[PDB]
């Protein structure tokens, strides 16, 4: 029976889409809170859960990756730092911004990635790709007006500006992580999961130390973050978030193996709309002319670019 499901096409895409939604909803649940401040601690727990999960699977012979080598970690530390900066600014941006606004704002990353490659990696941008970049700038502008239509005090606007600062920094940190990691993967030759294994190995020590220096580790503050009554729910949300990162990685390699890479690029772009709607259903998000049309213009822009890369790779 397991063989029948293994080769299925529809199942491979359903598992990936549900694991992507699971990651966003649980991450947003813990992050939002009201008194949550320990962002570094949360990221450290998610990384520890990832290392324990893959360590469990490899023991049972469901996933194969390399064996840690000290000489192989000194050449991967720079990418560990770039991962720390990317995830942290992603938690801050998601903490202050809604899930829909965050998702479309994340499309600004591929503008920096695509134009990052032309300067150094010798790539090019076709007319379809350029037409997309304009639509994702338009979606960004509309969404900014969507949030700004509900702020009427000195506060509730400085919160927006903090959300945009952490979002813009995360855009430049995600572009840097993708480009640099691409440059170094030629040197290291990691293939399927060892890239995730080292990422979540070095990320753990860095996050733990950064939590000690930056976050407030006191008796009072810890009580605010994790009230005794709501400990069980918060802990279960953190565990599901960490194990959802492994679930998406295993279901992504699963999707590519069955339905090729052509369908996986379109599945990632199409899945953005379910991720955005999950914010409206699960959390209180503003609904109006600007915000609703921002989801569909930012969705159309992502779809057009995905078709643009599909055309470029064809020839």
């Amino acid at each position, epitope marked *: 029976l397991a063989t029948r499901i293994s080769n299925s096409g529809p199942i491979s895409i359903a598992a990936y889409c549900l694991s992507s939604i699971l990651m966003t909803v649980t991450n947003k649940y813990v992050l*939002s809170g009201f008194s949550f401040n320990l962002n570094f601690f949360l990221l450290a727990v998610q990384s520890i859960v990832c290392i324990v999960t893959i360590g469990s699977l490899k023991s049972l012979n469901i996933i194969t990756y390399r064996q840690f080598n000290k000489d192989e970690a000194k050449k991967w530390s720079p990418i560990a730092f770039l991962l720390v900066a990317m995830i942290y600014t992603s938690s801050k941006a998601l903490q202050y911004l809604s899930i829909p606004v965050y998702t479309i704002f994340k499309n600004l990353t591929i503008i920096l990635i695509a134009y990052g490659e032309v300067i150094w990696f010798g790539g090019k941008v076709t007319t379809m790709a350029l037409s997309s970049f304009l639509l994702m700038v338009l979606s960004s502008v509309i969404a900014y007006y969507g949030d700004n239509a*509900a702020v009427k005090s000195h506060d509730d606007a400085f919160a927006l500006y903090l959300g945009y600062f952490w979002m813009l920094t995360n855009c430049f940190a995600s572009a840097a992580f993708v480009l640099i990691m691409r440059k170094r993967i030629k040197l290291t030759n990691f293939k399927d999961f060892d890239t995730m294994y080292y990422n979540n190995l070095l990320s753990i020590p860095i996050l733990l130390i950064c939590s000690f220096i930056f976050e407030d580790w006191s008796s009072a503050n810890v009580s605010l973050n994790f009230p005794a009554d709501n400990r069980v729910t918060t802990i279960t949300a953190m565990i599901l978030s960490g194990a959802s990162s492994v679930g998406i990685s295993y279901c992504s390699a699963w999707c590519v193996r069955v339905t090729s890479s052509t369908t996986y690029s379109m599945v990632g772009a199409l899945n953005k709309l379910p991720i955005a709607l999950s914010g409206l259903i699960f959390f*209180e998000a503003a609904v109006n002319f600007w915000s609703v049309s921002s989801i569909f213009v930012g969705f159309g822009a992502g779809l057009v670019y995905a078709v643009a890369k599909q055309k470029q790779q064809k020839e």
Partner: nanobody
Amino acid sequence: QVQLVESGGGLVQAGGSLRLSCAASGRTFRSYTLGWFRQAPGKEREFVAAIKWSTDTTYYADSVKGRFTISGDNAKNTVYLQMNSLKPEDTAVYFCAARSLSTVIAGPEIPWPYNSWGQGTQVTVS
């Protein structure tokens, strides 16, 4: 540190009126639902009222409909809970709980989605 602080509790004769507040020592109540619970001396926590900050939609408990009035002043990030015609049974510690999840997944009367809580204030009615 972000904490919710209540004020206005005290002792009031039966049939009187009172007002309680729930301020914030940090971020704003935008995109949150604020609820008011009560813990009688020897019973469990009970829902009293709730309000959605942005859309100002209020959900009221069964036994406090037509007596209480939860309202929100957007100019100071404070949530009020007027109490009228208090019966002696209202004696309890009133807590304020912030929340982010939506009412679709869990009802407004369920405590688990409430991820923050204030210390609370003793309200006594004789």
